[PDB]
């Protein structure tokens, strides 16, 4: 954590800088070039004509604004680079650009505003015609203008401390000797002006390289890239022209162009076309007016950048930059020159755009804005939630039972933790909204606890019904009432927000059930209610202890300091690594978060010490007004963060103190959407219980089916009818003519005698039919059943034989035919289909269940079979319809959206792998020597292990094939190397400690009390290191078969305690000699202070010394001498 904020944005907020810009623009800059005086001492002689166009093109207001913005960016980046830890350059005062306070920054900007207002024309340098130096005269005019301005407005005492400060800044502005590195102000003005003037010098590529080399030593390589990128953006925003940068002549010219230092005029001459191979091979540079002769040649830019050392050292060897006329932001710079506000707003816009685009380019681009289609498990969870809404009687006090299956608190909790709530809520409907009130009625008496331990428990159902439940409201009004319940934060909202993020501790089953039930329904209501013009800023309050706040501030500072919008190269890989490892947006929550537009309400009513400010340039957030605005105030909004939208910090400002005196911080967050933030999903976790319920329902259908099997004994009935008709065939012949006529025509219910006609009928048709049916029913040959029923005696034959016994037999055969067809339809369609869908649910295969569904017969086909009871028919049709309507949506969108940007992920993985390998090698290089190094190594190992976990997650995401295992050979190899280093480190530390202790044992021949103190301090340090090794050995060696050997460390401690004993012997000798040598109060005032100092040192020794017999003897001697001194004081000194 730095002592100053990572952000400096004076131009946006400050008043004095803007006032100074307005004054200078109204007085000097906003006027045509007047032309230099022909004679400075004689105005009457007139003026020379301006050397260029009278308009202030190159040095107008645009130049001043761009230079001031570049100076502010330079300080921005210098502070960032110091925070990252890489050393910066130093000016001759020994100060660093990160050490300039904001007050000096404001003074520097004010004194920079006057740097160019003195000019009269575009002449530069010494003039041969008049022997004059227009630069000095112009800057003298500027110095006089600055002095006049500072005197006129009485600025001294307001900003500047005294006259000497004004004189220092005047000497800065005058620039008599171009003292480029005297002090940070000199650098921050001069090199900023040079960076801005870079655009005019030609050739552009060499000028850009030289400017990079100038900025590198002062701010750093990454800073030398960021500043140039920002200045390019300012160039395009304000509307200047930029020459084309083309360092490898890709546009196919005859040559890249002669190499020439634009500021100095250096040119490299080769003698006889001997192309070199390194920069050091170049001979010394000739001057600008050197002539070529014979077969000599100028070094070409292409050949110069073909050299390898320049390629390695200077990153811009390969790059290519966009020309200005290609984008043609031309010529509205002349329009920007008319008013300061336009250019200042454009500068601020570009500055914000750079910072946002850095992060957005660091992450993957947004493939689509339309939301995902639901995952199979989310559809299952939505169905489960609706089914629970169906009835609350199935809810028990410590578990949820539904459709013959129970659910634990774990299921609801990890359903909340894992799955989306927005899509699941969107899957619900209004019948569930009414079932909400039904559930509230059922759960009237259950208790509820808030997060405040002193809060009185409340019955949630009673509270809802009395206060929340509006009298006879329509469904939309109940949705608004649910939002209204969300409004009452104190008693109910805290518990919900703590449960939904695992922050809860000690809540029972009904509270977690209510949370997982209410969150999707509340979000559903929020989407359904209304659309409101969304404000572009939101302030969210929070209350946190300082201990958490410091870590949060450090994480935000690291994230801000690592994101950079480089020009030449891409550091997107580092930004992605740093954001994921340190982001805190999971704390922002996955629930309805209450926000407001007005900071005043937060600072007055709540007085919270932590405030989040969210920006939504893309409109990714969709805040909604709080339902019924009739009672709901204007400044109350609810926001739901999707999973693929994450918040990242860009500003950390210390704004003020709370009424309790605690510092209040205000963060700023930019919402970014990217498929990279979609968490990995443990799919199928909730599909399993749903499949279990479906299987249970199918099994209950099978239960009813085998009950109907038990209902009829078809085999016995068929056998009985066969026996009866065999007996009928065995009857004596009924040969009476009238008997035959009555037998055939009339309902003769007396067939104890059979006519020959009906006997032949039976023998020919019924005997084969029933015998075949019986044989089939023994063998269960079912197509053979169908064939026999095709052989069945036609109703025409029974109409011929209308005897009453024949009619009864025909009725029995119709009953048996219906029973046989019922058995046919069951054992062919349903029972095999029920078994098949049982396997499919066991296999969790939707397609096989659907196939078994198609195999199942239709409802009307079952209705044809009258022998099937209406209860079983209804049950079977209900099973069919339920499985259809539950599985068909379940088949939809079984594939999660795919992260298809393979190139970006692969490149990022390769860069990260190289970086972590380099860091592991650097860790391997380490050899510790003390406790602090050991602790630093432990922390480094921990963060490297976290980086390896990040690598594991990225590698898992890189895995696209479903039928291959994910590889961790490289990551595990680095982990093994790190563990080997972890084993080696304590051994090296112990060896170094032992060697240093052996060195320390050499006591000096002559020892003084300060030597006593210093050598005791060294001994204490070594003893503390040995105690650290003791604790490490105790921690690690627990459970090992080897004994807890510490004899060697106890020997080292014995050496150190003998050291202590000898040193304490010297101390005690001196102290006792001084005590016995006391003669008077003067000798007391001389010795007793020294005696007491030695005795305090001896008490420190006793604290370090153990309770051994020799140690206790020394302690007893020290205590006896101290008691003698104390007695002498207390008694004799009053004497």
Domain boundary at 335, 367, 395, which? 335
Cβ neighbours, 10 Å, residue 960: 11
**Judgement on whether residues 860 and 914 belong to the same structural domain of the protein:** no
Token pair of 722, please?
Answer: 């066969």
Cβ neighbours, 10 Å, residue 901: 15
Cβ neighbours, 10 Å, residue 77: 24
Q: Are 673 and 608 in contact (CB under 8 A)?
A: no
**Judgement on whether residues 556 and 607 belong to the same structural domain of the protein:** yes
Report d(CA 178, CA 1077) in Å as an integer: 71
Q: Are 853 and 880 in contact (CB under 8 A)?
A: yes
Q: How many domains does the chain have?
A: 7
**Judgement on whether residues 524 and 655 belong to the same structural domain of the protein:** no
| CA neighbours closer than 13 Å in the CB half-sphere of residue 724 | 14
**Judgement on whether residues 772 and 913 belong to the same structural domain of the protein:** no
Beta bridge partners of 670: 615, 648
Domain, as residue range, for 1120: 1001-1132
Q: What would the DSSP string read from start to end of 121-174?
A: SS--SB-TTT--BHHHHHHHHHHHHHHHHHHHTT-BTTTB-SHHHHHHHHHHHH
Report d(CA 58, CA 1081) in Å as an integer: 85
Helix residue ranges per DSSP H, 491-617: 494-499, 509-529, 546-562, 572-582, 599-601
**Judgement on whether residues 973 and 1081 belong to the same structural domain of the protein:** no
Q: Is residue 794 part of a domain?
A: yes
Q: What are phi and psi of 117, to 5 degrees?
A: -70, 0
Q: Which residues of 272-286 are buried (b: 16+ CB within 10 A; e: fewer)?
A: eeeebeeeeeeeebe
Residue with tokens 């660093």: 96
Q: Is residue 862 part of a domain?
A: yes
Q: Is residue 994 part of a domain?
A: no
Angle at 295 between CA 292 and CA 301, to 5 degrees: 70
Token pair of 942, please?
Answer: 């921990």
Report d(CA 658, CA 466) in Å as an integer: 37
* Helix (H), strand (E) counts: the chain: 44, 11
Token pair of 804, please?
Answer: 């009453």
Q: Are 637 and 540 in contact (CB under 8 A)?
A: no
Q: Are 5 and 653 in contact (CB under 8 A)?
A: yes
User: What is the distance, to the nearest Å, from the Cα of residue 449 to the centroid of all Cα atoms in its chain?
Assistant: 31
- In terms of C-beta distances under 8 Å and separation of at least 24 residues, what long-range contacts does 835-838 make, across chains too? 837/694, 837/698, 837/883, 838/695, 838/698, 838/699
**Judgement on whether residues 1033 and 983 belong to the same structural domain of the protein:** no
Closest residue by Cα to residue 534 from 638, 651, 642: 638
Q: What are phi and psi of 449, to 5 degrees?
A: -120, 140
Q: Are 850 and 856 in contact (CB under 8 A)?
A: no
Closest residue by Cα to residue 151 from 167, 129, 130, 131: 167
Q: What would the DSSP string read from start to end of 973-1023?
A: HHHHHHHHHHHHHHHHHHHHHHHHHHHHT---SS--HHHHHHHHHHHHHHH
- The torsion region of residue 46 among left (phi > 0), alpha (psi -120 to 50) and beta comes to left
**Judgement on whether residues 976 and 1007 belong to the same structural domain of the protein:** no
Q: What are phi and psi of 126, to 5 degrees?
A: -70, 145
Token pair of 429, please?
Answer: 């409907």
- In terms of C-beta distances under 8 Å and separation of at least 24 residues, what long-range contacts does 1041-1045 make, across chains too? none
Cβ neighbours, 10 Å, residue 1048: 11
**Judgement on whether residues 385 and 460 belong to the same structural domain of the protein:** yes
Label the pairing between strands 537-542 and 637-639. unpaired
SS3 884: helix
Report d(CA 597, CA 616) in Å as an integer: 13
**Judgement on whether residues 711 and 831 belong to the same structural domain of the protein:** yes
Report d(CA 137, CA 132) in Å as an integer: 9
Q: What would the DSSP string read from start to end of 375-416?
A: PHHHHHHHHHHHHHHH-STTB-SS-EEETTEEE-HHHHHHHH
Domain boundary at 638, 655, 678, which? 678
Report d(CA 30, CA 1076) in Å as an integer: 90
Domain boundary at 293, 320, 347, which? 320
Q: Is residue 894 part of a domain?
A: no
Beta bridge partners of 611: 541, 666
User: To one decimal place, what's the resolution in Å?
Assistant: 4.0
**Judgement on whether residues 189 and 131 belong to the same structural domain of the protein:** yes
**Judgement on whether residues 744 and 846 belong to the same structural domain of the protein:** yes
Report d(CA 473, CA 479) in Å as an integer: 10
Report d(CA 1052, CA 1061) in Å as an integer: 14
Give helix 687-711 / helix 831-843 axis angle, nearest 10°. Answer: 160
Q: Is residue 1050 part of a domain?
A: yes
Q: Is residue 801 part of a domain?
A: yes
Cβ neighbours, 10 Å, residue 406: 12
Q: Is residue 1036 part of a domain?
A: yes
- DSSP symbol at 299: P
- In terms of C-beta distances under 8 Å and separation of at least 24 residues, what long-range contacts does 747-750 make, across chains too? 747/802, 747/803, 747/804, 747/807, 748/803, 748/804, 748/805, 749/803, 749/804, 749/805, 749/808, 750/804, 750/805
**Judgement on whether residues 695 and 671 belong to the same structural domain of the protein:** no
Question: Residue 3, preceding bond cis, omega within 30 degrees?
Answer: no
Report d(CA 204, CA 69) in Å as an integer: 22
Q: Is residue 1040 part of a domain?
A: yes
């Amino acid at each position: 954590a730095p002592k100053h904020s990572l952000d400096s944005k004076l131009l946006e907020n400050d008043d004095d800088v803007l006032d100074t810009i307005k004054y200078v623009h109204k007085e000097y800059l906003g006027k045509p070039y007047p032309g230099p005086l022909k004679n400075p001492k004689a105005p009457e002689e007139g003026r020379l004509p301006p050397n260029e166009g009278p308009d202030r093109g190159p040095h107008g207001l645009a130049h001043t604004v761009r230079t001031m913005a570049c100076a502010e960016v330079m300080i921005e980046e210098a502070r960032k680079a110091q925070l990252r830890g890489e050393t910066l350059g130093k000016a001759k005062n020994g100060q660093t650009l990160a050490d300039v306070t904001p007050e000096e920054l404001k003074k520097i900007l004010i004194a920079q505003a006057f740097f160019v207002v003195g000019r009269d024309d575009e002449r530069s340098g010494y003039d041969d015609v008049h022997k004059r130096n227009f630069y000095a005269e112009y800057h003298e005019k500027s110095e006089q203008a600055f002095r006049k301005y500072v005197e006129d407005n009485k600025l001294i005492g307001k900003i500047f401390k005294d006259q000497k400060e004004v004189d220092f800044y005047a000497a800065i502005i005058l620039d008599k000797n171009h003292e480029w590195d005297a002090t940070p102000a000199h650098i921050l003005i001069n090199q900023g002006h040079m960076v801005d003037l870079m655009r005019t010098k030609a050739p552009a590529e060499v000028a850009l390289e030289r400017t990079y080399n100038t900025l590198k030593g002062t701010v750093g390589s990454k800073g030398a890239e960021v500043v140039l990128k920002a200045h390019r953006d300012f160039f395009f925003a304000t509307g200047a022209v930029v020459p084309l940068v083309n360092p490898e002549a890709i546009d196919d010219p005859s040559r890249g162009g002669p190499y020439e230092n634009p500021y100095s005029g250096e040119k490299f001459v080769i003698v006889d076309d001997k192309v070199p191979a390194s920069k050091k091979d170049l001979p010394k540079a000739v001057n600008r007016d050197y002539k070529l002769k014979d077969n000599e040649r100028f070094l070409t830019i292409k050949e110069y950048y073909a050299f390898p050392d320049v390629q390695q050292t200077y990153p811009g060897y390969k790059t290519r930059l966009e020309a200005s006329s290609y984008y043609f932001p031309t010529p509205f710079a002349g329009e920007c020159e008319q008013n300061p506000a336009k250019c200042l707003g454009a500068i601020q816009k570009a500055r914000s755009k750079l910072q946002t685009d850095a992060i957005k380019n660091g992450f993957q681009s947004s493939s689509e804005k339309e939301r995902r289609q639901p995952n199979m498990d989310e559809i299952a969870a939505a169905r489960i939630i609706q089914q629970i809404m169906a009835n609350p009687d199935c809810i028990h006090d410590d578990h949820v039972l539904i459709n013959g299956q129970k659910l634990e608190e774990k299921f609801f909790r990890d359903l909340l933790a894992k799955c989306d709530m927005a899509v699941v809520g969107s899957l619900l409907n209004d019948t569930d909204i009414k079932n909400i009130d039904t559930l509230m009625r059922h759960e009237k008496n259950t208790e509820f606890h808030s997060t405040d331990p002193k809060a009185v428990p409340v019955k949630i159902g009673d509270a809802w019904e009395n206060r929340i439940r509006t009298k006879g409201g329509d469904v939309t009004q109940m949705k608004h009432d649910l939002i209204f319940l969300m409004q009452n934060d104190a008693w109910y909202f805290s518990r919900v927000n703590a449960i939904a993020q695992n922050r809860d501790k000690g809540s029972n089953f009904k509270e977690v059930l209510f949370t997982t039930l209410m969150t999707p329904l509340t979000n559903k209501s929020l989407i359904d209610t209304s659309h409101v013009p969304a404000p572009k800023k939101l302030y969210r309050g929070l209350n946190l202890p300082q201990e958490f706040t410091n870590k949060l501030i450090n994480q935000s500072n690291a994230i801000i300091a690592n994101t950079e919008n480089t020009l030449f190269t891409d550091l997107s890989a580092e930004a992605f690594k740093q954001i994921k490892l340190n982001d805190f947006s999971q704390m922002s929550g996955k629930t309805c978060a209450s926000t407001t537009k007005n900071m005043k309400l937060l600072t007055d009513i709540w007085g919270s010490n932590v405030i989040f400010e969210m920006l939504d340039p893309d409109g990714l957030l969709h805040p909604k007004q709080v339902g019924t605005h009739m009672a709901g105030s204007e400044d109350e909004f609810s926001v739901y963060l999707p999973e693929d939208v994450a918040l990242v910090p860009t500003k950390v400002t210390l704004e003020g103190k709370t009424d309790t005196g605690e510092d209040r911080y205000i963060f700023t967050l930019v919402a970014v959407k990217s498929p990279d933030f979609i968490p990995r999903h443990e799919s199928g976790y909730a599909v399993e219980p749903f499949m279990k319920m479906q299987k249970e329902k199918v099994t209950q259908a099978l239960d009813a089916i085998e009950k109907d099997k038990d209902s009829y004994n078809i085999d016995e009935q068929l056998k009985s009818l066969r026996t009866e008709m065999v007996r009928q065939a065995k009857l004596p012949l009924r040969e009476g003519v009238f008997d035959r006529l009555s037998h055939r025509l009339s309902l003769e219910t007396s067939d104890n005698k059979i006519s020959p006609e009906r006997r032949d009928f039976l023998n020919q048709h019924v005997i084969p039919v029933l015998q075949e049916c019986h044989i089939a029913l023994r063998a269960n040959d079912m197509d053979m059943m169908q064939k026999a029923l095709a052989k069945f005696p036609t109703d025409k034959q029974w109409s011929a034989f209308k005897s009453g016994e024949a009619v009864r037999a025909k009725a029995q055969m119709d009953v048996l035919k219906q029973q046989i067809e019922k058995k046919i339809m069951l054992q062919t369609q349903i029972i095999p289909a029920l078994t098949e869908c049982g396997e499919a649910l066991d296999k969790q295969n939707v397609t096989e269940a659907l196939q078994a569904l198609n195999k199942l017969p239709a409802e009307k086909e079952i209705g044809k079979v009258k022998t099937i009871g209406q209860e079983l028919r209804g049950q079977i049709v209900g099973v069919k319809q339920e499985l259809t309507g539950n599985l068909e949506p379940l088949q939809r969108a079984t594939t999660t959206p795919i992260v298809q940007d393979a190139e970006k992920i692969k490149v990022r993985y390769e860069t990260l792998l190289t970086d972590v390998t380099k860091r592991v090698t650097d860790f391997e290089k380490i050899k510790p020597a003390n406790l602090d190094g050991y602790n630093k190594a432990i922390a480094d190992l921990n963060n490297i292990q976290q980086e390896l976990n990040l690598l594991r997650n990225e590698k898992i995401r890189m895995h696209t094939d479903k039928d291959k295992a994910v590889d961790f050979s490289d990551i595990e190899a680095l982990d093994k190397r790190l563990q080997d280093v972890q084993s080696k480190l304590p051994t090296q530390l112990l060896e170094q400690t032992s060697k240093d202790v052996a060195k320390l044992a050499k006591m000096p021949e002559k020892i003084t009390f300060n030597d006593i103190k210093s050598m005791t301090s060294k001994m204490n340090n070594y003893l503390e290191t040995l105690e650290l090794i003791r604790n490490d050995r105790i921690k690690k060696h627990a459970g090992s078969t080897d004994p807890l050997d510490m004899s060697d460390l106890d020997g080292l401690k014995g050496q150190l305690q003998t050291y202590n004993q000898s040193m304490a012997d010297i101390l005690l000798r001196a102290a006792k000699s001084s005590l016995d040598k006391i003669k008077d109060p003067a000798t007391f005032e001389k010795e007793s202070p020294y005696i007491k100092q030695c005795f305090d040192h001896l008490a420190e020794l006793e604290k370090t010394l153990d309770d051994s017999d020799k140690g206790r003897k020394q302690k007893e001697d020290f205590t006896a001498y101290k008691s003698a001194l104390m007695d002498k004081q207390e008694k004799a000194y009053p004497e």
